[PDB]
Write a protein that binds this ligand. Structure first.
Ligand SMILES: Nc1nc2c(ncn2[C@@H]2O[C@H](COP(=O)(O)OP(=O)(O)NP(=O)(O)O)[C@@H](O)[C@H]2O)c(=O)[nH]1
Ligand SMILES: [Mg+2]
Length: 166
């Protein structure tokens, strides 16, 4: 096995836990809506390689977390999540990427920009705008819905591939 340390970041309510839980769930527990940041594990085969993903579901910058800095030092790749119906969450992406750069002292950290809640008609962030932003960062952009499952595996596996290609 190869182990990957993934960190999910983004503003309050964008769907960080929903995404993480949807990926990692074994469905013994019907509904699980975590109230606190936590770490989860998932074994998956990605391109023939058996991967152990450790996924940290972080709190928004709005919440205090003592270990936030070490989380970013330990993290190998980051999913930067905003919601396509939440313009402020999109604008906040800059702050998450700056935090990661300040802590890791690097311009070249593996990351994927994730526009969540793509099941919703009430869109305020157009796909093209997010593609531009991801292009400016030199990272992939993937739209997801934790509710419909669209894009969820793709977002996480793309991040693993970014770590690999680093
Ligand atoms: N329509 C829709 N709602 C979603 C989606 N993902 C999450 N939600 C909803 O958005 C809300 C916030 O989700 P949650 O998973 O708690 O987000 P979070 O980013 O972990 N929040 P927090 O920062 O407070 O931990 C919940 O009501 C959840 O059901 C999605 O893809 N589509
Ligand atoms: Mg959460």
């Amino acid at each position: 096995m190869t182990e990957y340390k993934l960190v999910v970041v983004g503003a309050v309510g964008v769907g960080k836990s929903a995404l993480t839980i949807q990926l990692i769930q074994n469905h013994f527990v019907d509904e699980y809506d975590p109230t606190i940041e936590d770490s989860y594990r998932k074994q998956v085969v990605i391109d023939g390689e058996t991967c152990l993903l450790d996924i940290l579901d972080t709190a928004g910058q709005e919440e205090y977390s003592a270990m936030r800095d070490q989380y970013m030092r330990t993290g190998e790749g980051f999913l930067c999540v905003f919601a396509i119906n939440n313009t402020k969450s999109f604008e906040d992406i800059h702050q998450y990427r700056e935090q990661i750069k300040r802590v890791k002292d690097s311009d070249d950290v593996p990351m994927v920009l994730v526009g969540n809640k793509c099941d919703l008609a009430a869109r305020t962030v157009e796909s093209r705008q997010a593609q531009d932003l991801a292009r400016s960062y030199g990272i992939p952009y993937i739209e997801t819905s934790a509710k419909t499952r669209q894009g969820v595996e793709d977002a996480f596996y793309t991040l693993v591939r970014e770590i690999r290609q680093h």
